[PDB]
Design a protein around this ligand. Structure first.
Ligand SMILES: *[C@](O)(C(=O)NC1CCCC1)[C@H](C[C@@H]1CCNC1=O)NC(=O)[C@@H]1[C@H]2CCC[C@H]2CN1C(=O)[C@@H](NC(=O)C(F)(F)F)C1CCCCC1
Ligand SMILES: *[C@](O)(C(=O)NC1CCCC1)[C@H](C[C@@H]1CCNC1=O)NC(=O)[C@@H]1[C@H]2CCC[C@H]2CN1C(=O)[C@@H](NC(=O)C(F)(F)F)C1CCCCC1
Lengths: 301, 301
């Protein structure tokens, strides 16, 4: 039945995307009820960005310094406040398309959908993982700032990411919707570096189970192993240690396939030690770590 | 800035997805104006599907044999007709969320976004290519039938795919919105086979340009080649021949990077002849053929 990098349907979030302008700076905002959330660096000039004092920069602004456009209609700003690295703009109209929503802070290894936006206009949607080093491997150009990441459980949108910056390795960094950065990054145009990344082991194992459920079995073997002996090989290949919490989460997939977790661990070990020898798994020549156990169950129903 | 398999925002299509039930068969339909489009096999029992006569099966049905649910509201059917492999259900309410739309039949090598749907509820969105053998490498379970594929240009949705079936290789087949199958497939549970697939050469070249635009340059070389000598190596690696039409389409990417098309061809030749030697391009260990030149320009702005 097949296995694809699948994003959440983006309709509930499209209806919240607006354009926020302050002087010559234009980026994207999220309009929920009578509040528009955007990156605070909207109030910055090129010069300010080298070493901004945001509190100073903001006390020098008024409501009228902020143009908020929902498509054609201009929303009148009637209030502003900063929360960490996000600006909150109180507007005179509650968004009639406000979905059921929450603000959630995701953990490294968890996945979410990104709605790339330019000038408040949705451009595309794709799935990302919060990397262990708190970066995301996104696709973001100038104008993307204020684009959000989200999960949809039932009809409730859980917002977990707002886009702020690109690092020199070509990966991306931003905040939760309360304005707290993921990882040790700051909203200043200064030399900053992604820390060394690791492979999300539990997600590789989840993807191996997805493979089996779709009829790729070539990489399986009769062997098993212990959490301990497996984790020695993980250490060696720059893979996150696997925990009992990780084995427990892989349970439903373990049952559905009848392959024990520590049996599937023995498969990963041999793949790590010998490579794939010109073969592929779910159309990849690399071990994929951007599917969670939940993503695999969800998609393989 | 990064490169991702990116789907169109799915909002305009979510607002068109309905559930169609006929007896015990439930699948998805597309509600545009006062018409609901769905797979004609909705009128089939398990038994009928082994060798249906659809004309017969349909003449034995009335408007009242079709329950159409848009979320919680039931739409009253006031007409029905078959067009090839699609059923058209005239309903008593024009869809207030009908976007600007077209029905288009796409060519092999072209891409589109799929909104996977179950019980008329959007489940996920992802990008697909119409393969040269007229299959798509989708992710579709029982209940997916009636799920649509589409491109969005300006605010106009061009619908190009409706889902009908899975082939034994685990790839998928269906129709345009006028009910004509892509490829030599029929809507009957009988032994049918995907033909041998080729790699979309123009899309691999487009993806190499995307690579250069994002700073992957390792695979470039000083050499060039001719269309003919390149096509000799394409033949050998099960790659579609490249045409002047393909070279012309790659022009804007050729210009933007200053790498001539036949220069980038000499790179593909060496990648085909010697492989990648443990290196990756845009995070893939395989040559990717599901990005069009348009997809690369659009995303790499
Ligand atoms: C974002 O602000 C944006 O989209 N703003 C638009 C409105 C005004 C101009 C465009 C922008 C998004 C990135 C641009 C390229 N790809 C992106 O994802 N972010 C930034 O430009 C961001 C600002 C805001 C906080 C810090 C500064 C600098 N910055 C960066 O992304 C830079 N990164 C760094 O300085 C650092 F080293 F990572 F810290 C990039 C440096 C290379 C060139 C592109 C920007
Ligand atoms: C689709 O009709 C559906 O979703 N309908 C729902 C309502 C009733 C039950 C589910 C369904 C979608 C596929 C099922 C698995 N994944 C899919 O993409 N299509 C079919 O089942 C389709 C019907 C309609 C036209 C032909 C028959 C048979 N069929 C198939 O997909 C089978 N393929 C073939 O018979 C053939 F060889 F390709 F010709 C599949 C065979 C094995 C896998 C399950 C069905």
């Amino acid at each position: 039945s097949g296995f694809r990098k699948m994003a959440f349907p983006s309709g509930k979030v499209e209806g919240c995307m607006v354009q926020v302008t302050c002087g010559t700076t234009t980026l994207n905002g999220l309009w929920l009820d009578d509040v528009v959330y955007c990156p605070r660096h909207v109030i910055c000039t090129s010069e300010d960005m080298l070493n901004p004092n945001y509190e100073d920069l903001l006390i020098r602004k008024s409501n009228h310094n902020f143009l908020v456009q929902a498509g054609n209609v201009q929303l009148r700003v009637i209030g502003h406040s900063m929360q960490n690295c996000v600006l909150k703009l109180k507007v005179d109209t509650a968004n009639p398309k406000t979905p059921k929503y929450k603000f959630v802070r995701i953990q490294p290894g968890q996945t979410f959908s990104v709605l790339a936006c330019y000038n408040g206009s949705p451009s595309g949607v794709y799935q990302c993982a919060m990397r262990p080093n708190f970066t995301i491997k996104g696709s973001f150009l100038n104008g993307s700032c204020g684009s959000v990441g989200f999960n949809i459980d039932y009809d409730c949108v859980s917002f977990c990411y707002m886009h702020h910056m690109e690092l020199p390795t070509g990966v991306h960094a931003g905040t939760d919707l309360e304005g707290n950065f993921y990882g040790p990054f700051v909203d200043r145009q200064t030399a900053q570096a992604a820390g060394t990344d690791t492979t999300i082991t539990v997600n590789v194992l989840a993807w191996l189970y997805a493979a089996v459920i779709n009829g790729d079995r070539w990489f399986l073997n009769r062997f098993t192993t212990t959490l301990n002996d497996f984790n020695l090989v993980a250490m060696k290949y720059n893979y996150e240690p696997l925990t009992q919490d990780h084995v427990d989460i892989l349970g439903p997939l373990s049952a559905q396939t009848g392959i024990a977790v520590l049996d599937m661990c023995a498969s990963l070990k041999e793949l790590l030690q010998n490579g794939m020898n010109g073969r592929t798994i779910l159309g990849s020549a690399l071990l994929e770590d951007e599917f969670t156990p939940f993503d695999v169950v969800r998609q393989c129903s």
